[PDB]
């Protein structure tokens with residue numbers, strides 16, 4: 001029954017708002033807004049970076065460390081959202097870990113797109129905006145870790161999804177039965193089948209003129225995999241070149257034996 005699918009869509013969107021403080025709606029209002037109350041301070045070079053610290057050791061590493069801290073925070077928010085997905089907390093506890101282990105980063109880059117345009121990315125809960133060019137200008141190990149994310153974002157943002165769409169799509173990503181090491185795949189696939197039904201109806205009702213948006217959104221899950229694998233390889237180079245830099249334990253376990 002379609003009424004049951006709309007109830008699941010509403011449930012996930014409600015939990016989405018409650019779990020993620022900075023939504024796409026708020027992010028787009030800051031990036032495009034004529035508004036005067038929520039304009040961000042823009043960081044585009046070293047001087048503005050130093051002044052931005054007042055308004056809001058090596059620079060490249062200090063940026064990379066703050067990027068980690070935000071990723072850890074995003075994992076915490078994604079984990080809170082996953083518990084709201086009907087059936088997720090009832091699954092085998094080991095599979096819950098496995099689904100989060102492989103899903104968080106694919107979700108992080110999906111939602112990171114909400115904070116991005118072709119010119120840069122919002123930071124500090126929308127208070128700041130770091131330009132895409134300043135990130136490319138960083139030292140050779142840290143000058144390339146965001147550029148692939150921007151490339152995905154500009155394409156993904158062309159789909160013009162809103163938060164109500166993303167809430168369901170994010171749930172579909174977590175409940176993937178093809179994750180390595182899943183003990184009982186069937187109960188996971190049964191949940192995804194229902195989430196996929198809810199996403200399909202959501203996109204046909206919210207985007208009636210967007211032809212095959214459902215299929216085109218699912219195909220984007222291939223771009224996400226590429227980003228993760230490329231990011232993992234970049235992290236291995238950094239751990240060898242910078243033996244004094246520390247990675248967050250939560251992020252270390254997520255990447256432990258990923259592929």
Ligand SMILES: CCCC[C@H](CC)COC(=O)c1ccccc1C(=O)O
Nearest residue numbers: 064067068070071074108112121251
């Ligand atoms: C401009 C701010 C972008 C922040 C987002 C996370 C929401 C993307 O950061 C990462 O994915 C990341 C970056 C450096 C080191 C580790 C990671 C990581 O998650 O493992």
Ligand SMILES: CCCC[C@H](CC)COC(=O)c1ccccc1C(=O)O
Nearest residue numbers: 022063066067070123124125126130
């Ligand atoms: C909730 C929305 C994102 C919030 C966080 C920061 C709390 C995003 O900020 C960053 O990742 C970041 C990147 C480069 C330089 C500084 C930072 C930084 O720690 O501010």
